[PDB]
Amino acid sequence: TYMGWWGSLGSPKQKYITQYTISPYAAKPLKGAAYNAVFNTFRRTKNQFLYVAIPFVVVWSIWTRARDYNEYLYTKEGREELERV
Amino acid sequence: TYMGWWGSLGSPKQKYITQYTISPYAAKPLKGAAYNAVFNTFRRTKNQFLYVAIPFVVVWSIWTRARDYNEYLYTKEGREELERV
Amino acid sequence: MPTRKSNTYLSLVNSYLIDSPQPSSINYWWNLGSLLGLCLVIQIASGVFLAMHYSSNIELAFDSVEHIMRDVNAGWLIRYIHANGASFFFICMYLHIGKALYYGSYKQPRVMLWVIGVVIFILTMAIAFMGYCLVYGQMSHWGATVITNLLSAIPFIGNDIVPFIWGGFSVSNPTIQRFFALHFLLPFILAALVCMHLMALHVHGSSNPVGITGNIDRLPMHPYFIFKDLITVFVFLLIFSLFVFYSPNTLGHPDNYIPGNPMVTPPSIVPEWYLLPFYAILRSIPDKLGGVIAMFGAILILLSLPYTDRSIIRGNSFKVLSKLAFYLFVFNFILLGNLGQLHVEVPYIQLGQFATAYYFAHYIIVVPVISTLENILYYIGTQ
Amino acid sequence: MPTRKSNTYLSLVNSYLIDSPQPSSINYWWNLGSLLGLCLVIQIASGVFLAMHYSSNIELAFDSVEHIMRDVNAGWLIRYIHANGASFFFICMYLHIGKALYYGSYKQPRVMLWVIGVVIFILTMAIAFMGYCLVYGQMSHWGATVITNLLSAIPFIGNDIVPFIWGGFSVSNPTIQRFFALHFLLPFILAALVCMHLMALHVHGSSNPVGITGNIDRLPMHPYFIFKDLITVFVFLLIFSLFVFYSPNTLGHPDNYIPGNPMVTPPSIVPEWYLLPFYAILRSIPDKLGGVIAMFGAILILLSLPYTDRSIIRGNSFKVLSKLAFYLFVFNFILLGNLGQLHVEVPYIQLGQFATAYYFAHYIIVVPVISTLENILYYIGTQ
Amino acid sequence: NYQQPDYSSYLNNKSGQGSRNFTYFMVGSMGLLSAAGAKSTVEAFLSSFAASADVLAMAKVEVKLGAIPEGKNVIIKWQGKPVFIRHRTADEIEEANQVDIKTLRDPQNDADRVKKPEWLIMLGICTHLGCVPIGEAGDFGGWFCPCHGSHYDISGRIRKGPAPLNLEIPEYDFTDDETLL
Amino acid sequence: VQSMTSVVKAANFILARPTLSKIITPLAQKFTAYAGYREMGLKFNDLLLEETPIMQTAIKRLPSELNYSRNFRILTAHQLALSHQLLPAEKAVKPEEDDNYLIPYILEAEKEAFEKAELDNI
Amino acid sequence: VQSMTSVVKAANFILARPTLSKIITPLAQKFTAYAGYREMGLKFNDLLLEETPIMQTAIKRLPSELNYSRNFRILTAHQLALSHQLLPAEKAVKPEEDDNYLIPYILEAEKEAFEKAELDNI
Amino acid sequence: ATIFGGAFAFQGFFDVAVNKWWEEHNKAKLWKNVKGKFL
Ligand code: HEM
Ligand code: HEM
Ligand code: HEM
Ligand code: HEM
Ligand code: FES
Known part of the structure; x- marks a missing residue:
């Protein structure tokens, strides 16, 4: 198969990559939700608009x-034209 | 678990045991069906009878x-004894 | 790898049917499971073809059944199957429990499996009873009435649960309709429970008549025990035909062919034969709450059995006293079934009380006492 | 090991719900799957509670539904749940097909899954349609009649298959009773197909909005995508409540509240909205046999899709022309659905023929041609 | 290696390729007997799907015929589908006298579409998406299919619309003031 | 299930007292002969319920020769049950060959488990 | 799925002809710019459908440095899609860095597979 | 496959054998044989 369990998910030998993160309790939830959901959402809509607009x-x-x-x-x-059809 | 697949069924290390057998198409099918189904069945019934007969x-x-x-x-x-009960 | 292993679906079918490493020493009793599964199909199959014609309305249930028998092309065949096949489903289930009781198939590595077994049993009984209530004959209606009246004995909720069951103030149209719906349904819940049964079987495999480990000599299943399954299946179908086509109403009760009438109780009320033992137990205990508790215990104490069985050796095949105890228990169970259909009379009330007493004493005294005694006897004899 | 891995059933629940290694980049679209399962439960749950009161007899079907609506305690709630929940089931299923079409979830490693998907779709449609026939309103009866008449177009067996479908000489009591039986059943066959879908998903895992392999960065499911599934489920239930409690009949057709009358056809025959597109295709092709063949192809061609999509890159997220093609196809599908409910008129017959033409052309021309063109454009661009 | 157990008694007496041929014979016989039994069972079950004896008895039900206004279209309920019994006057017969070998999806005439003009029998179900036609909206003067606007001729022939054929004529026979299906 | 520690405890409780010994031991041999496992080549310890961690450890700590002999006896018993035939009297396991070979290892396993349980609750 | 060998055949069929080259190549660059994958750190060959034996072999035969770079780029793309953000233009993969690093190995795998198929039908 | 066709051979063989033995064992009782007496 193309996806094993956690021990071996089929990823190639991965090395030299460091991942950092902080505890959820130590991180601010919904930081820029107000600003993000507006500006970034508008950015995404701007990027994807034409593909939905031209077909639409x-x-x-x-x-x-x-x-x-x-x-x-x-x-x-329209009676005459309906009759002709 | 206590029963793996064919490669490792959980059987202890087995060794020195040789299992011979002959193919079908080269053995007399129902070799002793008629004689066995009578004599051996009677023997089995004789052995197991008492266990079913005494409780029965x-x-x-x-x-x-x-x-x-x-x-x-x-x-x-029985009318009188029925009344007394 | 072979297609029968590479594909996940065929891999499952293989793991359960084609390469399941069954032990080489299993008798024909181990075939009963397959039959049960077969019967589960038949009950469903014929069942799905009866609901296509059965009308669940109380004023139409019995007339609809008679329409199936008389008007539908093969309707008589479908009904006789769906009924005698339920009777045979319970014959095979009782044989499958008897085998699991004789050989220690309920012991340690398979206790979980055993539990699902019991649940299946319980669930099945419901289904069967509920389905029987759908015929709405005299015995159908009055069995429903007696069951609900007994369940009315719960300490506090009893007075309130019964209307929720009846859907009214007595067995009537809502009761029959809900019984039909839940009866169509619960068989699929039982199919899921059977899948869980098979999973718990596959985790640790099946036992042996000798009890000892089978890992030393295990056989595939496709050329072996599939062709044994065919013998057992064809014997099952041959007897099932001897019943369905010849004397199909032998197992049923004639009063069930009289349309249900609440204003006239029939001379005697008996469940369909396979529930007679427990019914007998229910009558052995005077208290209604006591009776229902004792009955459901008579079914659930199978769960206690794997822990009361203090035997070091799995199974009865090599045990003298335990075999006598097992056969005595089986014959007392048949005696309870017999007393279930017999009127509550002078000798039978006491006989049924004693039979219930011994039925429970089996699990809670005889199995532990006999198992311990035989462990000690084995050790002393070998020394 | 932890109890969630040692136990067999908890091990399965862990493999599919707690530890399933989902990719970390999956959108909310991947939650639709869960919703569908939830919907499958609702359709079943509420469904089982309607069979407890629904009487399948033709002269009682509509009256029985009205009894549910007016007499049963929460019967109105259960009926509205069961109807609007079928509508939402199909909304979520169309979204789940649209996602699988946009991202290449149907490509090489998951074709089997895709195939099961299509089957599920097919099966569900039947179920839904059959369920509709149970209400036996005007639209119910006449939709059943039209479907059967069209199925009568099979070259030779058509004249003989339809009476088997009717159980008579026209949509009547046997037809409604058998529809009720098959409609109660086929949902459980669909549950089995859903389990097969889940196994075919688990063998290879789910795709990504980026399309690239997720094995490099995967996350467990219990902390993640369970509380995402909760968001999606509560949004689903919030909209489902907006519909069920407020304007519950918006998705349904008013004529379905007129008891079925074979002697007076309603002005227009239309399925429930979710079947309109295919219906439109059916009316686009003049020949009845051609119409049925084209209708069934309109679904089955999803099977051809994984092979006609010649793209080396999975998914549309990084493909310009393919995104235009996909959105054009989606909007043409909505146009077909709209034409489904409009009368056969001067512009609409030609518009429906063109819409069906392009609906099939998508799969058999646009997807292969566009995919190949985009492969070439990619390679030329990077060099 | 070593001495094998003696199987002499267990060995078969029959030819090398012959015993396997006989095994093939019986395994195939078992398979085909099982197929025959499954065929019988499946046929028996599916036969339940077919019309039950009640539905067969109810069909072919005679209709209470008799005098009725000329040109009026009566309605019946034979075999579920509506039956549009019409006692078309001599005017309708004269109109149908005009033969039509073209401009008709199925050229026909009252010669075969009716036994007698005084009693015309024709199923009201339409051809494409079977529906009950309106008895007076027909563009050709007969029935009209409201679903698609199809027009049914006085003789039952499909004049315009999506009609795949002409108005089907039931198999009802006629008698003295009675309908004999 | 009953532990071999408890089984041996009861057996030695009986064997120590002459009256119970005289009454039971003849009955013990009679019961073990009527059990019928010896006619299939099995020694008593072959019948023991293998599917337990204690017992699994006990087998896993058997010598080589005893392990192979146990394997062969179990296989012979399976074959005999498979073919519905028994060993002739001369080939059956004699009472003196039923030597309780595996009991010491099971007792050691139970001793280890009992000490671990006792010390965990020190 | 289109074999990469066929894709390169078509690409060289177009590139060899000056008219088709002058027409397509500008559209090729424009299409790869509008595709939007470069702003997420992905090179073209990262997008390729990995779940195929030929592609899987090609990945398995990558040099160590290319393999680790590919792993990091894929991880970065996953994180960006996860956080719903794109790389700034200065950090996005420039057109010159979209260097078609994996195509040679894919073509070698395709060549091996096609030779095996041809000889198997010799 | 040939299973479908072959099943017809056995089904027809047994069906005709039984439908020829039954109306011979019971010929004195069936309707078609008794109707003459009451006509
Ligand atoms: C293990 C599962 C099942 C068992 C043991 C079982 C057993 C029974 C039994 C004993 C009856 C009594 C019928 C009589 O006495 O005439 C019955 C009735 C019935 N059962 Fe089942 N059944 C099962 C599953 C099903 C299923 C899946 C269906 C699906 C429709 C079904 C449909 C019916 C119907 C419609 C009746 C009404 C009986 C009649 O109209 O003659 N059953 N069932
Ligand atoms: C539809 C009903 C059932 C089905 C289809 C089913 C299925 C099976 C199958 C396929 C087997 C393996 C063959 C065999 O050992 O006989 C099995 C064994 C078993 N059956 Fe069931 N079962 C059912 C109900 C029950 C019930 C109600 C019980 C007990 C209350 C039970 C207890 C067992 C046990 C304990 C085993 C394991 C036997 C062993 O390993 O020695 N089963 N079952
Ligand atoms: C009751 C209906 C269904 C259920 C419960 C179901 C279940 C699921 C689940 C749990 C997932 C994983 C979550 C996700 O990827 O969104 C999934 C994905 C998927 N669904 Fe379904 N499914 C259903 C119907 C369908 C149908 C009708 C189709 C297509 C005709 C389909 C196509 C897919 C595919 C191809 C995937 C894999 C998505 C991927 O890996 O990108 N499903 N499904
Ligand atoms: C995915 C599975 C299912 C789907 C999509 C589905 C869908 C539907 C739909 C759309 C209707 C039309 C009802 C209306 O418009 O008023 C319906 C009717 C019905 N369905 Fe379901 N259904 C499913 C499963 C079930 C199940 C498991 C049951 C179990 C009883 C059931 C019972 C009914 C009943 C009794 C009706 C009659 C409608 C009424 O009386 O109002 N359905 N179904
Ligand atoms: S009305 Fe639909 S075609 Fe006659």
Whole structure:
């Protein structure tokens, strides 16, 4: 398999890396939650916006044209065009 | 645990024991089925009979006594003894 | 590695069926487990095909059963299976408990396994009883009524729990509907318990008729004990056919074919045969609370058994006195089952009290006393 | 060893919940799995409490549901839980498929898991649909009728399979009763498939939002991703309560509260929202057999996805074009779902045909072409 | 190495490739007997899925026929699906007299779609997404499928819409003021 | 389960007193002969419940020859139970060969365990 | 999954032709810049799907210094994704450092596998 | 596979054997043989 248990997770020989951390009780919880959740969230949204906007814009433009045409067909002035279809 | 897989079943160090056997397709199947199923089965029943018969005899004697007493109670002669109980 | 080991799913199937290192000296009794599993399938299988036609409404339960018997194409077959197969499920379960009691399959390395066993037993009984209540015959209805009335004996909560069970003020439509739902369900909880049973079996393996360690000579399972499982399965199915097709109502009670009527109690109330022993115990104790406690103890004392069994040697195959005690216990259990169906009469009340006394005395006196005596006798004889 | 490792059952619980080495970089999306399990419990739990009052007979199904709503003590709560919880089950499952599609959770090491995923999806749909048929409202009955009529399009066996599905000559009492039985059952088969899903996950572990191997930096699950799962679970339950207690019928269709009447069809036939996309695909293809084949392909092609995705890099997080393609596919899927509930009209027939065309084109053209193009672009860029 | 135990008595008398062939024979016989038994059991169980005797008896149920206004469309409940018994007047018969070998997904005429114009029998279930058509909204003058707007001709032929076929005609026979299914 | 320490305690409680010895010992030999394990080649100590840490230690501390003889006797017993046949009288284990070979090691194991328990509760 | 050998074949097919090179290569650099993996400390070859026998062999045959550098870069990427932050532009992996260090070993593994497959069907 | 087809051979063989032995053992009792007397 590609993932063992804790003793051997399949990681390559790892060496020269030092990891530091502090106790949760000694660390401030939710330090910059107020500032982070605004500024960093806006940064993430800015980075990922176009990928969700361009597809959304295309699909919603297609949906809007289809919906508007459908609304137009079922009206007194759309009767003839509905009949032709 | 007390039973590992095939490589290490927990059996002590075993040594000097040679196990011979012949293949099927080269042995008489049901070699002594007819004679054994009679003689050996009778031998096994003979050995194990008393253990089943003495408890069975005791329990069935108790049951027979109770059943006969119950049948006797509900008769024109058992009416008085039934009333006394 | 072979596909039967590399793939996790096939790896599990292999560990349990194809390469499970079973001991080489196991009798045919060790096949009962497979049968039980087979029966669990059958109970479910036929069961799932009865709910497709069974209507749980109280005014439709019995008519729906008769519709299954008379109108559905193979409905008679499905019902007779689902019923006689439950009877056979309990036959095989009693044989599987008897085997575990004779051979010390409940002793140290497998105590955990034994515990799940007991739980399964308890759970199964519920299921069976509950399913029986679904037929809503005379005996069905009045069995439900008697059960709930006895459970009404809990010291303080008793008066309040019963309406929660009945879903009303007496066995009625809500009771039958909830019994149907929980009866459809609890078999799958029992399947989970059976999976836990198999896990606790696989951790330490199965025992031997000789009791001694099997590790010295263990056999695979695919060519061995799978083809023994087939003998046992086909014998089971042959007897199951002799019952299902010929005399399928032998194990049942005729009064169950009279639609339930609360205003007329039948002459006698008896559970389905396999619950008769415990029912007898319930009647042996006069107090209702005493009776229910004594009954549930009659089921739970199997848990105490692995600790009261002070035997140094696993199993009875090599023990003189313990074999006599075991067979006496088995025949007293059959006597309790017999007294369960018999009316509470002059000799039978005392006989049932004595039988219950000895049934509990087995576990709490005879097994420890006999095991200790035989340990001492073994040591003295060899010296 | 600690009790949480020595004991077999606690060892399993430890392997899957306490010590499972999750990657440290997993988003909140990886919590959806847990939610689904929780939802699977809710659907079961609440579900079992509705079978305790639901009467499967055709002339009592809708009235029995109304009895639950108006008469049973918390019956309204249990029904709303069971319905909106199926809707949320499918919301979470669609999110769990969307995550597995965005990050390459379906790629080489986890294909089996992915396959089980798809099966689960398939199975769940059936369950959900079958459960809907139990309400036997107008929409319930007519959805059942339309599904059966379309399934009658199999070349030869179609004319014979449908009467087996109906148990008669039209959606009637046998159909509803068998739907109730299979609907009560298949959730437990789905629990088994979920356990298989979990084993196939455990064999290789879960992926990362970065896609690269997590073995370099993994964390236990008990301190981490359990209290993350608690956040996700409480958000789930908070929204679930916003729905269940306030506007519980928002996701349902009003016509389902009109008791089923075979002689008067409702103005429009639409499944519950979560099945709308596939329904749309079904109406996009004119031929009934072609429609059913395309519908089932719309799900089964997820199996083809792990092989058509020719990307050397797992996941979309670091891929520009693939992210545009994935979001376009997601929005087209939502468009198909929307078209599912709209009438067959002038623009919408063509729009649904194009939407289905691109839905399949995603898997069979866009994923392979885009993945290969991006592999080439990556290699050229670094050199 | 050493002296093996003598198996002479245990050895089979039969040929080397023959005994394994016989073993194959019986193992395959066991497998195929088990397959036959499983087939029998599975068929027996699945046969429960099929229509129970009650449903079969209820079907093929005669309908109380008789005099009714000409052109009025009566409704029945044979085999669950609605039956649109219509006593179309001579005007409908004359209209159907116009043959149609084209512009019809299934060219047909009252010659086969009805035994007599005074009593027309036709199942109301539509073709695509079977639904009960409206008895007077048909674009062709007959029934109309509201779900897709399909129009059913007075003869039951599908004129417009997503109809995959024409209005199915039940297998009901006619008699003296009675319907004989 | 009963400890070999307690089993031997009771056995020596009985054996020391002539009346109980005379009454029981003939019954002990009769019970051990009727037990039927000797007909399968097993000595008494082969029957002992191996699945305990004390007993596992006891076997793990057996000599080589006794260990191999025990392995062969257990295998022979398994084979005899497998084939539903017994050793002839001449090949069965005689009463004098049932020599209680493993008891001393089990007693040593229990002595160690009991001292450890006592000192942990010093 | 596309074999790396095929990826390099396509890449050299494009690069050899000056028109396709002049068109794609600017888009190639732009695409690798917009990909966003460099801001997390990852080189391109860190993203490669490790869970394959060929790739696993390639990793197993890396030099020690490259192996440790890869381990640290992967760990840093995991930490950054965990804390929802990106490296500053001065610390991000520059285009020149995205040096395709692992491709030679991957190509050697692919060559060995393809030779084995070809000879197995000789 | 050939298991599916072969199962038909045995099923049909036993089915026809029993459905030919049964209406011979019971021919005096079945309906189709008694209906003549009451017609
Ligand atoms: C070990 C598990 C089970 C046992 C031991 C068991 C046993 C029984 C028994 C003894 C009855 C009495 C039926 C009679 O006397 O006519 C019964 C009834 C019933 N059981 Fe089961 N059962 C099990 C599981 C299931 C399951 C999984 C289902 C799923 C539907 C089910 C469905 C039913 C139904 C519908 C009835 C009603 C009986 C009838 O309508 O004839 N059972 N069960
Ligand atoms: C559906 C019900 C059950 C199933 C499917 C099942 C399954 C099994 C299987 C497959 C075996 C191995 C074969 C054998 O030893 O016979 C086994 C053994 C055993 N059965 Fe069960 N079991 C069930 C219920 C029970 C119950 C209710 C008890 C006791 C109350 C029990 C006690 C045992 C024990 C202790 C063993 C171990 C036997 C040994 O190792 O010697 N079982 N079981
Ligand atoms: C009751 C329904 C389901 C349950 C309980 C379930 C369970 C889980 C769990 C516990 C995880 C690990 C946590 C996570 O990765 O989010 C997981 C991941 C996953 N889910 Fe499911 N699953 C279900 C349905 C599905 C379905 C229907 C699909 C696809 C059609 C699917 C695809 C996956 C995949 C591929 C993964 C692995 C994610 C990865 O490693 O990146 N699951 N699932
Ligand atoms: C993942 C598993 C399941 C899913 C997704 C699911 C989903 C659904 C859905 C959507 C409905 C429609 C109800 C409505 O719209 O009012 C329904 C109905 C129903 N379900 Fe479930 N269900 C599941 C499992 C179960 C289980 C285990 C039971 C056990 C009894 C159950 C019992 C019922 C019942 C009785 C109904 C009838 C609806 C009513 O009376 O209101 N379901 N199910
Ligand atoms: S109404 Fe759906 S096709 Fe006739």
